[model samples]
Target: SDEEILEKLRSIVSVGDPKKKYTRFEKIGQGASGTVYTAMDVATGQEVAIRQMNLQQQPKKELIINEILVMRENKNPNIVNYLDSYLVGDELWVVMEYLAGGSLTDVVTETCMDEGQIAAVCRECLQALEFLHSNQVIHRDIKSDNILLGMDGSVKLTDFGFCAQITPEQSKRSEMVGTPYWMAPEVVTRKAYGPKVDIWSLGIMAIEMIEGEPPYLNENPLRALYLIATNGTPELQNPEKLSAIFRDFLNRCLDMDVEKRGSAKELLQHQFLKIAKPLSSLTPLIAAAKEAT
Candidate 1:
């Protein structure tokens, strides 16, 4: 068993020294990537996050390697920072900037967000997407659970495992990725898709923000994918609750035709963003959710 646990993480990219200093760190919980912890970097004397992935029995090694490659090149404010990765014996320890407020999912599961707050989050998400899409990167995964919030009110995109890199020479992608409820039709149906898939996810996230849950929250994962594949665009739980412009924004986001779906740049110009509350407005809301938790 000890030998079995000694499997090492192989990578296409280089990481920090196998040995680095960190202190006062404690486990957060087991996440998909691996067991995660909160730690203090002795070098910078600041708090950070650590994800400990065991190479043994870990089938998706490619995902972690890709995550490191994608995260290192990104520097947008709305995207999480990838500090360093350390090789700890058989384990891969990924270091990231710590966010105290947790994920946006935690917030919605506690106190629901108002329309302005929803728009605020959407605005921030779109900004991050704009940056990534401009560089020909597709987030592939962009659900509330992958969105982290700062204690002082900040929104950042996290989890780069499923993201895709596109060059104009290779325009579209046709791989399966993302959570069932938040997945776009193109992905669920295994069709060729592009950055527009992220727009579709943003649309689902918008509905999630308003309804306090995603459209297929209660469905089985396979069934949910089937729904998205066949149903194409999902409607809000309560359509009448949102303003016309807000609905219009969603309509543009979830368009079935990939080309018809608005780009992050185009969506940034939408009137809905003007009604969005400033990022600072998220402080109280995030605090409420952390307290509820």
Candidate 2:
């Protein structure tokens, strides 16, 4: 078992000494779930973002493994790629293709993107979710921070800590997980839901990308939940600021009643999406480069 573990661990380490080739820099981002750093891929001599999980809790051996399996099982460009992982003592290292561009959260904070740009992003994200949904998966946590931007002006879904693998029966529990502000009404209300909840999150993400913040945030989270469950989303004063198609599509996504919300397939066919196919096409190119390594 000792030699077997050594061989398995050695096989996962990046070839030619990652430390020698790529200089490890200071930490860039950290969260309750993981930590990220800016590093150079010595092979390509390019800056790549490296995210490593803190293994102190020792939740289960498969937690980190499931993340890699999910990435491999669903190989879509718009989705974040999991490059490789291995153990160094108790620590687990996950290597992925780096995106120099920050995240949607950073982009929105820096400058508000226009409706068309937001629409383009949503179209691509929905396509990714559609692929995952078809494969019996649910991105329980969908938010801006989970989206990483490439230097080439593309978005990819990165984090999957809260993702759930669904079976055909569509089960739900009162786990009450995921980012609070971005969760679906069903999730917030503690009701059972399936893939449609992800569509709701996409709608909220669309609004955040364009509007620069959720329309429903409050000084208090409880107040926000009350508003989300009772008040319904605010009306767009200037639909002219955005295209009619975009406004219609977003409204359907942000629908208060989950039963009335759109499906991933329907969202893909939205008029706004019909005009925004380029972003989706670019994702595979990013995936191909990562898969090669």
Candidate 3:
């Protein structure tokens, strides 16, 4: 069944709001390559976010397929819910559950999130990544913009365009690519890296949540990229206001060396997670699961 679905997903474009098949909605986002649209589903009366891959160029055959697979394989309340996708008329159509609260970057800038709330989101994101990296998927791009808030205060991870799957046994990587400010040193250096890169990105995201800016945002973009590689480690200015356990958790994620940095498992055991009411305790599965339904 999935094979049949995948086969169709490869070439179908713009399902046209399964509910209201005729209305062309307003554009929500326009990027360098494509655009995002919000439309109402006619059948279920639900709103959905639709991304139409604008392929004026080469059309990125491999990337489109990889993205579809990543979405199909991932399922979490904290991660964007990939509903369906298909290619039609030279453009790829991606359908997803709609998030109304907008991006975390906007929330952090417009509103202040206290330690507990911030920790909650961080934990949710790390849990999602645990599943992602467990399957060898690396979300090369992790930033405030890519983090969305659901109506229930849940954090949803979005945008998997740069995701890749890698294993420690293999040490090959493609060219360095990602937001320079949030990019890890290994990522910027194009070094052979593993799951730790996501940890680093999350670390920067935590800092941004607390400080309302990234650790190295003051520097120029180029210098910021270089500093991220050579700069020893970022220091949190106001540690007292934040939970001490969270501070340590953030530190482990920010660790430069890929080998020594904390894994999603270790982060769950850190003091920060003690606040949770224990869903289940089997050895040390640190990340907690969110019931998407």
Candidate 4:
């Protein structure tokens, strides 16, 4: 009987399929860069998000390289971690941690966040910006869609598609980039700008959090650009609705004069942020937003 069983085993050799270890689920997001999918690390049982982008004819090879370099070099809690990446044919697959709470855009749309919660978001984002600025990097896009949250009350800044690295000799970046509603005056004007542009966008984000929209959101996109360039500085339509300290912070950030606009490090110590609640305090709101969606 043993020899018969051995002969049967010899006739039927066994082996597993040689395939990728990741099991992908439904598509979660799509942007100009590529589509994102929720995936699982089958070996470790870890959930991950994968962004797949076709690299065919993409001229900016340096940008892609720098994205991976900068991400690997800068390790911050407020920044999303770039786990791994690989090239499959002409497509690049970027694997990152899965953020279950979606983005600040979803939270703002689904739930009304109090000033404290908004302050928490600002504080976290400011820390991330401060870190990026310290490293001489500029996050060209700083809008709600790029700000993600986790169910653990963690905030992460993602989407380095338009990010730029400033050299030591360069005082300002002249590239005109970023979303219209959150674009800084200097950025829209095509003037040389520095990390301060991010501060201006942060101000717009604050207004968006409190009012569910940025200034001139209802206006034509071209008009919004013109107004940002012609107008001295955009202020909150309903400043009275928020705390005075918060308004003061926004004013500091939105100052048309780029030199006058405080840096992220300076704003980190602002009174409004000093009173900001712990990041953990926003978990309930995030949970509510998730449930609502």
Q: Against the true structure, whose lDDT is highest?
A: 1
Q: How accurate locally, in lDDT, is each candidate?
A: 0.84, 0.70, 0.71, 0.81
> Clash totals for all models, in order?
0, 0, 10, 0
**What is the C-alpha lDDT profile of model 3 across 61-174, one tens digit per residue?**
567667777888777667888877656645566788887666778766655666666767777888888888787888888898898765555678988888887766664465
The estimated TM-scores of all candidates read 0.91, 0.81, 0.83, 0.88
Clashing pairs in 4: none
Better of 1 and 4 by TM-score: 1
Mind giving the per-residue lDDT tens digits that candidate 4 earns over 1-293? Answer: 43443343233322222127687666977876688889898888878988777765455655666677678788799998888776554566777888888789888878888888888899999999999999998998898889999988899999786888888788688887688888988876767888988999998898889888888989998899898899857766677888889888888988988889989999999999877788888788789888887
Q: Give the Cα error of residue 290 in candidate 3, in Å.
A: 24
Q: Under the 3 Å rule for N, CA and C atoms, how many clashes does model 3 have?
A: 10
Count clashing residue pairs in model 2: 0
Q: Tell me the tens digit of each residue's lDDT in model 1 across 1-293.
A: 34432332334323655335788879888966688888888888879988887776567776777788788888889999998877655678888899998889988888878889889999999999999999989999889999999997799999898899988778888878788888888775666788988988898888878877888889998899999889888866678978999999999998988778899999999999889988888888899989888
Worst 10 residues of 2 by lDDT: 284-293
Q: Provide the global lDDT of candidate 3 against the true structure.
A: 0.71
Rank order by TM-score, top first?
A: 1, 4, 3, 2
Superposed model 3: Cα runs more than 4 Å off:
1-24, 167-174, 276-293
